[PDB]
């Protein structure tokens, strides 16, 4: 009944500190964990458990939901969920006209968790002003947010989905973490109807009584303006922008254009647009529209995402595994800097899950502390990507404008 | 007593067996002391005699007591501790006085013989075995093991605190309007009941405590306010830091100045306006603790103003959850910020200061925002919510900076408050190149080996200059080249560099820096009317950049 789980030897379990939480989130967690404990899903634990992973409260719309941050445990469990019991990622999912995401996390609480592993799922509800000891729990069943849970529930899931897949062989279903991704080429009404059906199947096992269009995902090319008149500044701007692309795209040319700058000219001076220039200029436009020749996804390597603040509520992003070899670039638009960044991250994470079955480590243009306090104010997803914090090179920002 | 409470199961670190340190031969007097002490403990269940078959051992010492004729036993648990499992931490933080709710009454109860009043996992006691040696090691010593939590064992603080929490659990459940703060072997108990019903709830609590092995003092022996705790002084309606005296000294050693700075930092959480900047500068460098440091005049001015601040007592007030929190920040200069947090105007719950720098170069708008972040996190810890902010910066200044800046930010609710010095942007870089402004193509280069370099520029108006620099890096020469351009240009000017590094610094509109140059550059940028800064790729045969490139490359590249 219980699948035994090992850490990656000889790593020890997670010992991550609990971030500070407001009163209302603390209160919300107390209610939630009090009930789960009654229902036997977690148990209070003693100081002989040295482990910890952070826990947060979010809204997904009026209700509070518990989000345990298992990023550390996941990293330390990676032999189990990726290697021993990996879940295959279909390349067909990104092709579908419509993909719907369904939360199936409630399924996990019905399976018991290996008793020798439960201690590593320890978490702590803090108290305001440290006036009472944190309330400490560990899990007795598969926890949501641990990558091991879908690895373990994997075989039960295919049992559950078998009739539906058999009846709908052109629909693609992919489980990632707590979510089910369901894609098809049906017209939107037929697709939505097929989702309700799927919910009914799920409902006989576990679920209560969100919609992508991946084939409409297309690159956000590096833009080369079409302009009335060009200044020396515009040209220099342009060479720096092409000169940058030349490090990514095979075949980019600038030679027949910097010839325009020759001399030591004033920035504002207007300049005649050459034929050799307007030729390669347009030819480079051809190159920038296409995917990068020579760049391929390596399943063994981590994904990185970089995000630039463009202003006007606009955000540019690139996903790559080796720097400047972009697998994907794009934009996100439309208040609040942190709320928007938070939206963009979730969206980029989602597309990344659809396309590769993997989550990006994000390089975030923000102060660690700002992000840390505010992000859960807006976070809706049930996973959390890895991130670090960087100060954006001001030029990189310029090169991905619109 | 020994608490009837369930024991916490304890393990040694995996792959490890218990300690086996050899007992050193003691003097007779120490052996007698030990025997007397262990006999008494043995009678009360604290320890138990074991056979010779227990392989494990831990050194026991005995030393004199406070200059009296009393003896005290000292076990050396270093080796067991090295072998015992890690535990969860006792405290994640400690209350700040400012976050304590206003309340009618607080009683402090301490636990008698705390560790010895709690049982040790039975399967683990064997590992705590020690031996009282016979006189000059003639015969087999006397061997005991612990039945309770040892003094100095790694597990004791945590298992003790968690035993107390389990025991408290039901009493707190049944008494929701009673609050208890656990600290070490003290228990602070507070409520809004009136004296009688409070002194009555304390007895119920004592009795519950007693039914479980924990003795506590009676009304006659309970300590009274003010409570002295973690450096604080806690009264029924106010709190302050414990008394602080700044010594009179003709001369200050490193050690005196460190202690001064420590006390000053500690006072700053309720005495507003404390500064340590100039006293800290004194501490820079590796000097002996006994070394005398003459006070600079700035440090002397600083000590005086701090002395004035501390001259009259100041106190903080407690927290009323039904009113808003207001946080005010003021600029104190030289990257120094001071704040206050209150609910009713100017009755502070606490104060603080912020004088950090993130990066080498920065501006007042970034710094103010970092201070707000720091104060936000602190408020959430202490009160569980963010304060309303009152800031010395204009709403338009702030949105001008952050809508334009490339990093994201967000501070919660704030209002402008006119408490100079106000924070403002001191210059603005142009967004477009300037017509009819000279265009300097600057550049700088340094020979890696020579460690000497050149900085210069070429102009579209045919002008030009080159200067030679010593001890310089490629980074410095590029800032220097930009500095030349600003020194030799008029009030409006376009500048074209190929140093991303330099572009970055200037682009961020710094008003203060660690670099001498950057400050010279900053002063220039302020004097100008318009500056436009542009970047070009080096060595791409561009425009004027090529000329100033070779002009400066010579000697050598
Ligand atoms: Cl209110 C009061 C009344 C009489 C004497 C001192 C005080 C202030 S000290 C205080 N205020 N509230 C508390 C408690 C909070 C939670 C349980 S008791 N305390 C005691 C306390 C002492 C040391 C650290 C934290 C709290
Ligand atoms: Cl363990
Ligand atoms: Cl619709
Ligand atoms: Cl979409
Ligand atoms: Cl690929
Ligand atoms: Cl001393
Ligand atoms: Mg004490």
Swiss-Prot record, chain A:
Q: Specify the effect of residue 183 to A.
A: Confers resistance to efavirenz and nevirapine
| Outcome of swapping residue 68 to M | Confers resistance to stavudine and zalcitabine
Q: What is the effect of changing residue 49 to D?
A: Confers resistance to stavudine
Name the residues that bind Mg(2+) 1. 103, 178-179
Name the consequence of residue 61 to Y. Confers multi-NRTI resistance
Q: What is the effect of changing residue 39 to D?
A: Confers resistance to zidovudine
Q: What is the effect of changing residue 183 to C?
A: Confers resistance to efavirenz and nevirapine
**What does altering residue 112 to S do?**
Confers resistance to lodenosine
Domain of life of the source: Viruses
Q: Where is this site: Essential for RT p66/p51 heterodimerization?
A: 374, 387
Documented effect of changing residue 311 to D: Confers resistance to abacavir, lamivudine and zidovudine
Annotated consequence of substituting residue 62 to G: Confers resistance to didanosine, zalcitabine and zidovudine
- Outcome of mutating residue 261 to I, per the record? Confers resistance to delavirdine, efavirenz and nevirapine
| Impact after mutating residue 62 to D | Confers resistance to lamivudine, stavudine and rarely to zalcitabine
Q: What is the effect of changing residue 61 to G?
A: Confers multi-NRTI resistance
The reported result of mutating residue 63 to E is:
Confers resistance to adefovir and lamivudine
Consequence recorded when altering residue 204 to K: Confers resistance to lamivudine and zidovudine
Q: What is the effect of changing residue 96 to R?
A: Confers resistance to emivirine and trovirdine
What stretch of residues is annotated with the motif Tryptophan repeat motif? 371-387
Q: Provide the Reverse transcriptase domain boundaries.
A: 39-212
In UniProt terms, what is the effect of altering residue 63 to R? Confers resistance to zidovudine
Effect listed in the UniProt record for changing residue 131 to K: Confers resistance to emivirine
This chain belongs to the protein called p51 RT
Q: Which organism is it from?
A: Human immunodeficiency virus type 1 group M subtype B (isolate HXB2)
Lineage per the UniProt record: Viruses, Riboviria, Pararnavirae, Artverviricota, Revtraviricetes
């Amino acid at each position: 009944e219980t699948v035994p789980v090992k850490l990656k030897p000889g790593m020890d379990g997670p010992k991550v500190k609990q971030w500070p939480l407001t009163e209302e989130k603390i209160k919300a967690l107390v209610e939630i964990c009090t009930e789960m404990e009654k229902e036997g899903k977690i148990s209070k634990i003693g100081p002989e458990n040295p482990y910890n992973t952070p826990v947060f409260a979010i809204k997904k719309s009026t209700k509070w939901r518990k989000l345990v941050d298992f990023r550390e445990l996941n990293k330390r469990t990676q032999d189990f969920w990726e290697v021993q019991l990996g879940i295959p990622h279909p390349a067909g999912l990104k092709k579908k006209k419509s993909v719907t995401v369904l939360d199936v996390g409630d399924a996990y609480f019905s399976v018991p968790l290996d008793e020798d592993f439960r201690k590593y799922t320890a978490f702590t509800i803090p108290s305001i002003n440290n006036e009472t000891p944190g309330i400490r729990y560990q899990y007795n069943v598969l926890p949501q947010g641990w990558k091991g849970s879908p690895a373990i529930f994997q075989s039960s899931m295919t049992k559950i989905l078998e009739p539906f897949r058999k009846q709908n062989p052109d629909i693609v279903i992919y489980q990632y973490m707590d979510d089910l991704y369901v894609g098809s080429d049906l017209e939107i009404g037929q697709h939505r109807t097929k989702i309700e059906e799927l919910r009914q199947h799920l409902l006989r096992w576990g679920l209560t009584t969100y919609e992508l269009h991946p084939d409409k995902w297309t690159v956000q090319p590096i833009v080369l303006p079409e302009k009335d008149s060009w200044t020396v500044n515009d040209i220099q701007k342009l060479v720096g922008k092409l000169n940058w692309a030349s490090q990514i795209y095979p075949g980019i040319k600038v030679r027949q254009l910097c010839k325009l700058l020759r001399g030591t000219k004033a920035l504002t001076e207007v300049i005649p647009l050459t034929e050799e220039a307007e030729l390669e200029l347009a030819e480079n436009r051809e190159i920038l529209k296409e995917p990068v020749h020579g760049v391929y996804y390596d399943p063994s390597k981590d994904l990185i995402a970089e995000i630039q603040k463009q202003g006007q509520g606009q955000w540019t992003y690139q996903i790559y595994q080796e720097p400047f070899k972009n697998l994907k670039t794009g934009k996100y638009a439309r208040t609040n800097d942190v709320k928007q960044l938070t939206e963009a991250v979730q969206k980029i994470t989602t597309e990344s899950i659809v396309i590769w079955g993997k989550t990006p480590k994000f390089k975030l243009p923000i102060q660690k502390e700002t992000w840390e306090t505010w992000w859960t104010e807006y976070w809706q997803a049930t996973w959390i990507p890895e991130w670090e914090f960087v100060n954006t090179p001001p030029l990189v920002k310029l090169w991905y404008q619109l | 007593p020994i608490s009837p409470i369930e024991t916490v199961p304890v393990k040694l670190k995996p792959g490890m067996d218990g300690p086996k340190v050899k007992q050193w031969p003691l003097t007779e007097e120490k052996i007698k002391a030990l025997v007397e002490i262990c006999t008494e403990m043995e009678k009360e269940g604290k320890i138990s005699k074991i056979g010779p078959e227990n392989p494990y051992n831990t050194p026991v010492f005995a030393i004199k007591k406070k200059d009296s004729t009393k003896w005290r036993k000292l076990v050396d648990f270093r080796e067991l501790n090295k072998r015992t499992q890690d535990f969860w931490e006792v405290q994640l933080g400690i209350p700040h006085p400012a976050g304590l709710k206003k309340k009618k009454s607080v009683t402090v109860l301490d636990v008698g013989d705390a560790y010895f009043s709690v049982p040790l996992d039975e399967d683990f006691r064997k590992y705590t075995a020690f031996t009282i040696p016979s006189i000059n090691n003639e015969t087999p010593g006397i061997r005991y093991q612990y039945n309770v939590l040892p003094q100095g064992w790694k597990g004791s603080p945590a298992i003790f605190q968690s035993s107390m929490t389990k025991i408290l659990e039901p009493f707190r459940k049944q008494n929701p309007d009673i609050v208890i703060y656990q600290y070490m072997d003290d228990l602070y108990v507070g409520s809004d009941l009136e004296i009688g019903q409070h002194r009555t709830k304390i007895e119920e609590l004592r009795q519950h405590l007693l039914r479980w092995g924990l003795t506590t003092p009676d009304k006659k022996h309970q300590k009274e306010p003010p409570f002295l705790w973690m450096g604080y002084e806690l009264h029924p309606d106010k709190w302050t830091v414990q008394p602080i005296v700044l010594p009179e000294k003709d001369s200050w050693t490193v050690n005196d100045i460190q202690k001064l700075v420590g006390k000053l930092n500690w006072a700053s959480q309720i005495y507003p306006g404390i500064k340590v900047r100039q006293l800290c500068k004194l501490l820079r460098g590796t000097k002996a603790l006994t070394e005398v440091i003459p006070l600079t005049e700035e440090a002397e001015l600083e000590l005086a103003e701090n002395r004035e601040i501390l001259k009259e007592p100041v106190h903080g007030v407690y927290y009323d959850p039904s009113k808003d929190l207001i946080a005010e920040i003021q600029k104190q200069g030289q990257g120094q910020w001071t704040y206050q947090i209150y609910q009713e105007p100017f009755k502070n719950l606490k104060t603080g200061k912020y004088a950090r720098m993130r990066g080498a170069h920065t501006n007042d708008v970034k710094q103010l925002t970092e201070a707000v972040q720091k104060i936000t996190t602190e408020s959430i810890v202490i009160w569980g919510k963010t304060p309303k902010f009152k800031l010395p910066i204009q709403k338009e200044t702030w949105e001008t900076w952050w809508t334009e800046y490339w990093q994201a930010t967000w501070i919660p609710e704030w209002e402008f408050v006119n408490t100079p010095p106000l924070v403002k942007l001191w210059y603005q870089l142009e967004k477009e190149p300037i017509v009819g402004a000279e265009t300097f193509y600057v550049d700088g280069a340094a020979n890696r080996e020579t460690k000497l370099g050149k900085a210069g520029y070429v102009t579209n108006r045919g002008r030009q200059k080159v200067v030679t620099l010593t001890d310089t890096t490629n980074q410095k020469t590029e800032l220097q080249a930009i500095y030349l351009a600003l020194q030799d240009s008029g009030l409006e000017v376009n500048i074209v560099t190929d140093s991303q590094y330099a572009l970055g610094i200037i682009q961020a509109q710094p008003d203060q820096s660690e670099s001498e140059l950057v400050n010279q550059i900053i002063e220039q940028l302020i004097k100008k009317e318009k500056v436009y800064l542009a970047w070009v790729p080096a060595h791409k045969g561009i425009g004027g950049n090529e000329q100033v490139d070779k002009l400066v490359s010579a000697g050598i590249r």
